[PDB]
């Protein structure tokens, strides 16, 4: 079966929704899946400040720590990370300034990576900040496989080619997102599983 | 004198048009001299026959003057306003830029502020890259760049987009929080651009 | 055999001397190969002026426009425009353009995707353009291959991890953009191969 | 008064710290009060450790003091500089730009001026993208961003690099031609920021 990773940051707990979607999504086409959380690097007087935040800590407390072996391990990358600013959280950007070793040792290249991201409006920034995380996944030389519009469920969703982004609002999930997000990763696992078969 | 504004649009079924409208009278409203400017369609007529609101929207414009470099060299302020394509400014736009080439060479883009709109048929497919690739192209130049930022509320009731006004196209009038969206962030142009004029002389 | 199709512009020359290299780097790698010129859009007045450009067109007079059917035929795909602005060209964008009914029927997913790009200066929109046109290729849920840094040629030739990318200065070809642009289609050729074939 | 200048910059080995020191005697010259600013470091001894050009460089910037949400408040015009790490800015340089959500959330650095630089080993190797992320960030501030363009021949010269000073990181001396482009880009800068704050006395 194909190994699928899926590497998400998370403050107050849409992305681990999000994560978590896409693991039952992988696991249901037959994938290898691990869920792993990005590292926390806030000090705890600022989580200690907001009620979300505090509470999806502890929601995510049995879910392990990513850490390059896991892409190492992986042969399908789903990176997940709400966004600051237009570009991706530091959280998940320090898990990316450790991925050197692993990347001049060459095992980065021809991984799947795709991406997720999600925002308080529309359109602040959730097209822009899975593009920084295109661009950085380029670096490794992965074969990107982001959905574009491939199903109606896309355009039922908002229309997100570059890949699945959430509204965060606090309120749960719409169904039309988990959709959305269950066929970025459906559509990346049978890629994946044809990359490697035809390499015998 | 007053600012010296031109907003170049592109429109096909009328979307562009309708936004391009509202900044122009945006741009009036805060005490601007204002040029509305179509971008020029160079799409053949039977492919254009084809779709009857594209028809429409070309007769419907048939009163206003096409955009020309001669209308940058003028303008103090720029705006730009582009439907997606596949995330992306459309070819047409992208044509007129490319007709910019002297005027660059002049250094006579240089300091003009500049900001852009988008619009598509998805919420998310482009309204934030198409955008991105003008303001890229804009830093060519050496303009100014004001996009709005989050510096209303009344963006933030519009989708919050920061990067300039984007509206999605489904053949309605435009919303309500999609004009004050664009107000603000042509009144927010205009009022930085006259900032920059008086400090000069 | 893998179908490869090779879509450039050029006006000088530096689009077509780095197109030819590709197709040729395709054949080499047991592809069947289509080089596609993309039509010239600008008046025959402003073509007139130039002598480089006027030279190219009748270089590249027995090479065929491309056409959507092209990119219908294609399994693997290549586009290749100088800058303009940071950008594309127009005529790029204007092929670009007449791909919406053949992007409706879907008929455009699962196809490899890699881009390369002509400036002027080393640093002026180099990888800004190649952006541009992954950007695009997101939207028809192609599967970009980008090649990264997985070659000692890449790092050879300036280093773009996105797409091979030339600094025109009228000269011909340098032999590492030659070898850097080989890679990239050799690799995506590769790549395709094990995805059509492990897919049936 | 004069120009409120802030350099804010990161640095693992001295590159990006020769480059924004460069541009800080740019920014004196040009009258501007200036404050030189480093990013907190944030990496693990251990692996700081691994590197003893990292380290020595750390203790280089012993007296240069600490970056502040305080120096961006306190800033009329703002420079960032972050080598690139796989394309976009250091997570250092971005877990300072996190912090400032206080700031954003009150406004308080909209329509102040802004400029990116950059480093990289490699020429083609993300010294145009990770710029372009500083100013997709600087747009969500609503900050006025005055990039270099090409209004001069030293950015030719430099490299050709519109968007900002990049420098392709070898170990050698700051070349002669980056520094010229440093200096340009930050001389611009304080130059349109006093027109801007001129422009509303
Ligand atoms: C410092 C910081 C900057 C933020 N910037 C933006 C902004 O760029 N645009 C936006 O829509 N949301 C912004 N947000 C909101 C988060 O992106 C949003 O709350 C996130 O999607 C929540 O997801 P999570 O529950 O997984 O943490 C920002 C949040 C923080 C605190
Ligand atoms: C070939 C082409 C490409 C398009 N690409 C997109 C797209 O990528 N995302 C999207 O949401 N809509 C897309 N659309 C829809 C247009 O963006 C939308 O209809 C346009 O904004 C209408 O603007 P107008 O009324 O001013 O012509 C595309 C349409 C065509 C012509
Ligand atoms: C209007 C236009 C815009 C241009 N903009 C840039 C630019 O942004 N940066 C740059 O380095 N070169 C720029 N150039 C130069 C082209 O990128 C360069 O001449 C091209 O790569 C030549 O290759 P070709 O013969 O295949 O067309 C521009 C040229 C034109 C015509
Ligand atoms: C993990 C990491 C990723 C890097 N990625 C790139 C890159 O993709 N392209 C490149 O040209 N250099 C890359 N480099 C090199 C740094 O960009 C370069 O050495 C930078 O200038 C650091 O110099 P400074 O700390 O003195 O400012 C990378 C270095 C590290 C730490």
Same mark, same amino acid.
């Given at each position: 079966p194909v190994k699928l990773a899926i590497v998400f940051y998370s403050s107050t707990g849409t992305g681990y929704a999000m994560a978590q979607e896409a693991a039952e999504a992988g696991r249901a086409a037959g994938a290898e899946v691990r869920l792993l959380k990005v590292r926390e690097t806030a000090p705890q007087d600022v989580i200690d400040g907001q009620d979300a935040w505090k509470a999806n800590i502890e929601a995510m407390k049995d879910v392990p720590e990513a850490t390059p072996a896991d892409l190492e391990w992986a042969e399908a990358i789903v990176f997940s990370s709400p966004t600051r600013f237009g570009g991706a959280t530091s959280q998940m950007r320090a898990f990316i300034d450790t991925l050197g070793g692993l990347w001049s040792s060459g095992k980065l290249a021809n991984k799947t990576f795709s991406a997720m991201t999600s925002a308080q %409006?529309? %359109?602040?920034g959730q097209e822009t900040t899975l593009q920084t995380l295109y661009m950085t996944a380029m670096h490794w030389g992965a074969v990107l496989t982001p959905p574009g519009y491939t199903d109606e469920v896309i355009f039922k969703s908002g229309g997100n080619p570059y890949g699945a982004s959430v509204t965060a609002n606090g309120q749960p999930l719409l169904e039309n997102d988990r959709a959305s997000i269950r066929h970025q990763v459906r559509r990346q696992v049978e890629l994946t599983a044809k990359l490697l078969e035809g390499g015998s």
């Open positions: %409006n529309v %359109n602040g």
